[PDB]
Design a protein around this ligand. Structure first.
Ligand SMILES: Nc1nc2c(ncn2[C@@H]2O[C@H](COP(=O)(O)OP(=O)(O)OP(=O)(O)O)[C@@H](O)[C@H]2O)c(=O)[nH]1
Ligand SMILES: Nc1nc2c(ncn2[C@@H]2O[C@H](COP(=O)(O)OP(=O)(O)OP(=O)(O)O)[C@@H](O)[C@H]2O)c(=O)[nH]1
Ligand SMILES: Nc1nc2c(ncn2[C@@H]2O[C@H](COP(=O)(O)OP(=O)(O)O)[C@@H](O)[C@H]2O)c(=O)[nH]1
Ligand SMILES: Nc1nc2c(ncn2[C@@H]2O[C@H](COP(=O)(O)OP(=O)(O)O)[C@@H](O)[C@H]2O)c(=O)[nH]1
Ligand SMILES: [Mg+2]
Ligand SMILES: [Mg+2]
Lengths: 48, 430, 141, 430, 430, 430
């Protein structure tokens, strides 16, 4: 899954849920944060 | 309010009954005179003031052993008129003790059984002891079992028969009456335990280090096994087992109820205390093929169900930790259609020691009653021995002339063939 | 492999004349090697109910076929509710080893005497057809 | 008001009750002679929940003890706090079941149950406002698993609106003490789902694991397992006998923990549990209690709760503590473990606070969670059942007392359907 | 706040910790029974950095002790201040590694590490604000150099933003106690560079040289080397536990001493150090401290610092002193030695002042300098490694547990690349 | 929780086992009766109350030595049924003890080994002692090693074999069975230590100044070496070494594991105290070629790795200062591909003295286990002795008639040729 696909899923859940924090949104935000950390680590490894 | 009645018939039966009745009297504190100087009620009865009377009856056609009993130190214990005695011995002839002289004695025994049963209120079942390779023993045991099966019906009966050894034998005609008695008790007894003498001789030689044993040493071990089996009825325990809770756990099918026993530890006081006798090592020793109480190899067959009793200070978690180890081993394999096969009982009373005996005093012991597919070998070898002499009709005239029909030998052979086929049919995996 | 025994219950002949059963609903139980098979009740069954039912049994170790015949009987309880009960008419036991040699080559017709459990008297006779459907003992060794 | 009566059956249930009533009496300061000697006023305000009042000022439990053999109740009477039980409530037979479910449910258990139902009816009709019944029994035995479950149906037929509790010990395949355990376990689970309002499974294997790993004591015995089960039992009804911030009776838990009427099989656990040598190291705080409460090894069942997702959960805190901390910790334990909580029901944890802690402890927690991980126990039980049933092993014992194989087939099918429909909601998504 | 947890592995690390915790406890006035008996108020304000609080008012270190054999932890418990450690944190195996890196990193260390990671996670999740972890282990042993380095990667994978310290003892070729030292040193250096945020090398040879030449004591023992290492360890975090003119946590040192992420291997030294007979002659002044601080023989490593140029340097002064003198002396030590300082980074010395001196001393200094002279240690380690590996000596022990020669080749190549790129900046000019 | 089992087979093995078992009992304070009037656990086991039982088993086919053991002062120590004895001796015939009479005894020994191993929880490994130049010793040692290598697998086994002297010999046929046993243990034993009698005779003559030594004096020195090797497992030390930490440090390749030992100091009380016994002089004496415990010249070959144990009050810095001096000397040269070759262990417990013995009490001692290339000379001379008689097929009929094949002699010769070629191939520089 691309970072853009995960952000689009989060935005589509924000449009569907009247509540700012559904359990599904919280799991997707955790997935996005984990992936951004991996991409940042890969960039730091490529820059070495 | 729980009772059991033990039947002793034949010379071997009486000689093992004596062995168990010193042990019970010693274990319950009763002096040989019968006087104490609420657990006794399983084997004994209170007379109102003073002495206790055993719930046992002694049978024999040959009077020597009973006369020896009635003059020893235990003359005051047994009721004078429950030691039924005959005049003429059957002389190793099965047809004699089933058709000729046993019929005139069996009525008195049945009257005594009724008189003992009317006293009990919670009768658990009957015990019977008989050496199979003899005339009066096998014949009267067969006749008594056949009468009891119809007089009482669903009451449970347990048989501690002593089959002949594979090669060691005292008589020359014992296969005939052994086969006939197996025929008789196959459809009439709920449990049968194997007790041939050769295995117990090897046990004594290897562990007890006795090079010249006599019958008393064998009978004491058998008495200890009986006491371990029946301890749960008369002592408090964390995991109790009753006699009626056997055919639901050890008997997969009505035909298959022959199983072989083992006991552990067996050790003398000269070297017993040098080792710790942990529960794991005793439960390992109990499963050793060389410690079987019958000369059969369990490595030659599958297991069906194992019922094994502990007594002493054993803790259940240590028992589970040892059952797991046995399930781990690759040399012991159970039948496919039995995922769990162990029934465990735990009792608190340690085994009692008889003074002047062989066994020492220990705090832990284990007695196992295991039903296995390997038992068919004794049937096969007894059948082979029978066929050799039945081919030429040897010794048959001693049986035809005592009222038995010619065809009675063949149907016992057919029933043994059926049993051997059934044991093979059960042991195959699905 | 487990041997397959085909057992057909053809008919039963009830011999006990002192029970003129007004309306018998007879039904039968065939047991072999712990497996139980049951017929449907015959409506208006005479002293000679026909079943013509065939079952295949797997043989594991037993040699004995047990046949039992029952009737339905309606009894009023102490509250006058009609209670259906099954009354045994008779039970018989056949050892399959007696017929094994012939029953392998072709179906065998066999009569089984059914005795009443209370008096051991002949109550009925069951007519069975038995057909038995080893070479691999060296292969297994 | 809103009190419950105690009914126990079998040996295992009697041994559980023998410690449960000791724990309750020690909590309320009742001496083994029935005389109150407590210190606090609150110890007497709600004593009508479990104890009745008689002349002379002594208290008597409203417990009913039943078994098919007299030994266990004749033994529990001689133990500590054994005199509290009213002699009239002791009902027993003279035969026993022998671990055979058919005998304890069709032939013997049917005739005896009228007498025990008479005293049960006497106890329930009299009491001020009934809350319900709680049942302790074992699924590994014949008489217990038969008579108890038939009594469940008989009670449910007469009191359809009251609540019913059952604390059931199921036979684990690791520590097996009876070979016929799968048959009477499978037969009992069939009837138990149809009538019990709540069921709580307890396993001896999990108790041994807890005793060996958390308490780290060398030699576990049945007294320790009984003590843990008794503490867990007492923790559930604590707030019904004492004041608190949020009282929550059994019916309130029934409303909040059972989503669908057939999903009422919970697994429980008690915290804190610490070794003797480490009881000084630890500091009792709400985070320390909640981290041990959700620990997988702390569950009273061998089922692994991280192999499935919780449908709902409950916690019954004891002692005086701030509610804000409890709520925030419950939220935190649910945000950090979102993968193990089903997503289509939000806020699926119930909490309650009782201001009276256990005697000797400042804080305690009882955990009752309905999880999908319980399927594994029924899976293995059914696996052993179908491994043993395909050969019709030990079937004749059951079929000789009016039972047939059709009731076995229906029981297996219903149990498999329960297994399937319990996991159906595990894969369900919104 | 901003506290750290202690994790140690192996025998050498356990012996280092056994003195580090004694030094810390003596500094904070904690008795070996965990009871505070200090004199100053400041001794308790920041005690949460290293010690936890339990009921009863006693303090317990947040240390985790791990080894593959139980002997060393069974011995450290009987030593002074051995009771402070929580018994729950002790985790050990039953086999050991035998100085084999493969066994302590692939086969045995992989299965055990889950339990120690559980308690590590318990300790880190709970604490107020995490600062980081500090690790003590030896590169000359198998179990230590394997399990510690794998634990480094596991911790880094879960806490990528926290800081990580490692105090590593590398095997010197002068005092060699194990023949297989080069293999597990080279394998460990490969993994250590990728994950550790800071690394501090310590050599037994340099400790013996210091003890023999500066302190001039006749018979050095491991207790003296441990005491010196413990004083150096405590000096780094002093200002994080006490007020001062310029507080500087570990992260601030990380920012100022590491120019590039792969150059984080420092060598340290402690001042003052004087003999017993000359402790009265000397006068403690800032010039006297700074002249001994930059002395070549005072470094805790055999590496000669005038064989290369410092990339940067740090000093952590202790005691109450004027800042103007410290700054002017730092400038003077940098003007008189311009040849040994790299020229393209001006003002490459960091200073800090803490107002609380060590107990018994009025002034103290801890020196941490990143220099290019450290290349010589990796050069000799790789030289021995390639001398032994070319014949495949002792290779079968490692290759029999799933490891191959490719991981040896990659480790050698990466270590040589590190050696080359560390000296690349030595010849760099502006 | 660390254990080791020692195996004694043959007359020489039993006579050295007696020698080591006085020493261990004396060192742990246990009286000859086995009663004390936590370090014992390595060699002994607790029976629950009182006596200790050695973890040793004695094997022999010839009953004289065992009967002597069972009547001496140590009759009460050993378990009565672990002193396995035969009836007929092998009479220096290797084929007898490997094919004819050893097979019927080996099963009992393996059963005893299992019964001893199930008691241990942290089994480090096995020790075995056997004089190689005998029938039963070599044959049974070979058979036991071959059975153990497959029953247990990766557990470590150590062999203290006594090879024949270069020229001094007691038998005339010992080269044959020595070569065959070397064949057998080449691929089956992890460590083999050289112990020929002539070197120890020279040691006694030169140092102990005994002109008429007997076997007991030799066995006491061997026992002291064993105690020095295994001291690190049962006493606290600054630098510990385990048994499993050997093949990673002394065994460069799987085939090469024959090494020769030395001990120092060896001196009598009459002139011991006149000199200071510094660590430098004892570590110099240990490396003297004349103090090798096997009659081989280390000056004729390179060293591969040296593992050397200290015990007493030795300080590590003094050890390093002495390792440097040895590296300095020009008469001792190491192999090219090994830069560092020393593994050092330090223990605190001084060696214990046996009353009435030869050695005096000292505070410092050193034991070295060194692997060197010069060991090939003993193989070459044994091969030359073997070829002389195998050319004419002398004494072969005594082996062919005991079930051994004709070609079995040739392949042992080929394996020795392979070993000699391997030793030459390893010792050449790159
Ligand atoms: N274990 C054991 N077996 C015995 C003993 N006495 C006899 N037997 C066995 O019994 C078999 C023969 O039967 P017996 O009991 O001696 O004689 P019986 O049963 O009274 O039959 P009769 O010969 O007609 O008197 C022999 O083969 C023995 O093996 C005994 O004391 N102990
Ligand atoms: N060091 C030492 N060597 C011994 C001792 N006793 C015998 N040997 C050696 O053992 C060799 C012969 O083997 P033995 O141990 O005597 O006899 P064995 O091993 O039992 O073999 P068998 O002759 O079949 O009984 C001789 O060459 C001796 O050198 C001893 O007490 N100490
Ligand atoms: N916790 C506990 N469990 C027990 C105790 N005694 C027996 N059990 C369990 O109960 C099972 C046997 O049940 P059983 O006694 O046959 O029940 P019954 O047939 O109703 O008498 C065993 O598997 C034991 O694990 C006890 O004292 N405490
Ligand atoms: N400073 C110090 N170093 C030690 C001590 N004990 C051992 N060492 C060093 O540790 C090295 C051996 O490490 P080892 O014990 O095998 O580590 P392990 O494999 O993790 O147990 C030796 O070279 C010693 O120099 C000690 O008490 N203090
Ligand atoms: Mg007789
Ligand atoms: Mg000899």
């Amino acid at each position: 899954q691309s970072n853009d696909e995960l952000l689009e899923q989060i935005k589509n859940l924000e449009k569907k849920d009247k509540f700012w924090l559904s359990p599904e949104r919280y799991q997707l935000d955790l997935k996005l944060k984990k992936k951004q950390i991996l991409d940042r680590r890969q960039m730091l490894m490529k820059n070495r | 309010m729980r009772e059991v009645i033990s039947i002793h018939v034949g010379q071997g039966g009486i000689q093992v009954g004596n062995a168990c009745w010193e042990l019970f009297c010693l274990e319950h504190g009763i002096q040989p005179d019968g006087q104490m100087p609420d657990a006794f009620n399983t084997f004994f009865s209170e007379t109102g003031a003073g002495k206790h009377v055993p719930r046992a009856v002694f049978l024999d056609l040959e009077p020597t052993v009973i006369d020896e009993v009635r003059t020893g130190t235990y003359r005051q214990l047994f009721h004078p008129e429950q030691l039924i005695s005959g005049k003429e011995d059957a002389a190793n002839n099965f047809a004699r003790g089933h058709y000729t002289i046993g019929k005139e004695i069996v009525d008195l025994c049945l009257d005594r059984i009724r008189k003992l049963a009317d006293n009990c209120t919670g009768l658990q079942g009957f015990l019977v002891f008989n050496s199979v390779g003899g005339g009066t023993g096998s014949g009267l045991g067969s006749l008594l079992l056949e009468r009891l099966s119809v007089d009482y019906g669903k009451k449970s009966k347990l048989g501690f028969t002593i089959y002949p050894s594979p090669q060691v034998s005292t008589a020359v005609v014992e296969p005939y009456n052994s086969i006939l008695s197996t025929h008789s008790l196959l459809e009439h007894t709920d449990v049968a335990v194997m007790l041939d003498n050769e295995a117990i001789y090897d046990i004594c030689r290897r562990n007890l280090d006795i090079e010249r044993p006599t019958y008393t040493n064998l009978n004491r071990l058998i008495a200890q096994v009986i006491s371990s089996l029946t301890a749960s009825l008369r002592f408090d325990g964390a995991l109790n087992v009753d006699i009626t809770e056997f055919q639901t756990n050890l008997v997969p099918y009505p035909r298959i109820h022959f199983m072989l026993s083992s006991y552990a530890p067996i050790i003398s006081a000269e070297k017993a205390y040098h080792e710790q006798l942990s529960v794991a090592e005793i439960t390992n020793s109990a499963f050793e093929p060389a410690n079987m109480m019958a000369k059969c190899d369990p490595r030659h067959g599958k297991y069906m169900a194992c019922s094994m009793m502990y007594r002493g200070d054993v803790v259940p978690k240590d028992v589970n930790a040892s059952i797991a180890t046995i399930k781990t081993k690759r040399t012991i394999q159970f039948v496919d259609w039995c995922p769990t096969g162990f029934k465990v009982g735990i009792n608190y009373q340690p085994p009692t020691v008889v003074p002047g005996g062989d066994l020492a005093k220990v705090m832990r012991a284990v007695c196992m009653i295991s039903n296995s597919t390997a038992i068919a070998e004794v049937f096969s070898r007894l059948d082979h021995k029978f066929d050799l002499m039945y081919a030429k009709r040897a010794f048959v005239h001693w049986y035809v002339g005592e009222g038995m029909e010619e065809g009675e030998f063949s149907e016992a052979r057919e029933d043994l063939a059926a049993l051997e086929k059934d044991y093979e049919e059960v042991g195959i995996e699905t | 492999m487990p041997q397959k025994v085909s057992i057909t219950l053809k008919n039963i002949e009830v011999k006990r004349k002192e029970q003129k059963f007004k309306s018998m609903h007879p039904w039968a139980v065939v047991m072999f090697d712990g497996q139980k098979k049951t017929t449907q009740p015959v409506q208006n069954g005479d002293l000679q109910p026909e079943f013509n039912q065939t079952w295949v049994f797997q043989r594991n170790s037993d040699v004995n076929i047990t046949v039992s015949i029952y009737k339905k009987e309606y009894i009023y309880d102490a509250l006058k509710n009609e209670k259906e009960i099954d009354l045994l008419i008779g039970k018989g036991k056949l050892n399959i080893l007696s017929v094994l040699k012939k029953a392998i080559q072709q179906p065998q017709e066999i009569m089984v005497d059914l005795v009443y459990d209370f008096d051991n008297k002949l109550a009925a006779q069951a007519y069975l057809t038995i057909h038995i459907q080893g070479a691999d003992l060296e292969e297994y060794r | 008001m809103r009190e419950i009566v105690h009914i126990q059956g079998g040996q295992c249930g009697n041994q559980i009750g023998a410690k449960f009533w000791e724990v309750i009496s020690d909590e309320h300061g009742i001496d083994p002679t029935g005389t109150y000697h407590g210190d606090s006023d609150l110890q007497l305000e709600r004593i009508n929940v479990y104890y009745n009042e008689a002349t002379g000022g002594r208290y008597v439990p409203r417990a009913i003890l039943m078994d098919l053999e007299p030994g266990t109740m004749d033994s529990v009477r001689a133990g500590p706090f054994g005199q509290l039980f009213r002699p009239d409530n002791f009902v027993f037979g003279q035969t026993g079941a022998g671990n055979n479910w058919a005998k304890g449910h069709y032939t013997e258990g049917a005739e005896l149950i009228d007498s025990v139902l008479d005293v049960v009816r006497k106890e329930a009709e009299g009491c001020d406002c009934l809350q319900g019944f709680q049942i302790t029994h074992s699924l590994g035995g014949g008489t217990g698993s038969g008579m108890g479950t038939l009594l469940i149906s008989k009670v449910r037929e007469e009191y359809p609106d009251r609540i019913m509790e059952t604390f059931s010990v199921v036979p684990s395949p690791k520590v097996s003490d009876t070979v016929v355990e799968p048959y009477n376990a499978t037969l009992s689970v069939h009837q138990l789902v149809e009538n019990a309002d709540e069921c709580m499974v307890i396993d001896n294997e999990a108790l041994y694991d807890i005793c060996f790993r958390t308490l780290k004591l060398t030699t576990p015995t049945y007294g320790d397992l009984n003590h843990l089960v008794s503490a867990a039992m007492s923790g559930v009804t604590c707030c019904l006998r004492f004041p608190g911030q949020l009282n929550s009776d059994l019916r309130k838990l029934a409303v909040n923990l059972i989503p669908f009427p057939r999903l009422h099989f919970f697994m429980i656990g008690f915290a804190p549990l610490t070794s003797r040598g480490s009881q000084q190291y630890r500091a009792l705080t709400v985070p320390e209690l909640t981290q041990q409460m959700f620990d997988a090894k702390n569950m009273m069942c061998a089922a692994d709760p991280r192999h499935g997702r919780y449908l709902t959960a409950s916690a019954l805190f004891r002692g005086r503590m701030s509610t804000k901390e409890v709520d925030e910790q419950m939220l935190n334990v649910q945000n950090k473990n979102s993968s193990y909580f089903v997503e289509w029901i939000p806020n699926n944890i119930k909490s309650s606070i009782c201001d009276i802690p256990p005697k000797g402890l400042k804080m305690a927690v009882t955990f009752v969670g309905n999880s999908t991980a319980i399927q594994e126990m029924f899976k293995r039980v059914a696996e052993q059942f179908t491994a043993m049933f395909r050969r019709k092993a030990f079937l004749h014992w059951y079929t000789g007392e009016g039972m047939d194989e059709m009731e076995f087939t229906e029981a297996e099918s219903n149990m498999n359907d329960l297994v399937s429909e319990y996991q159906q909601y595990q894969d369900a998504t919104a």
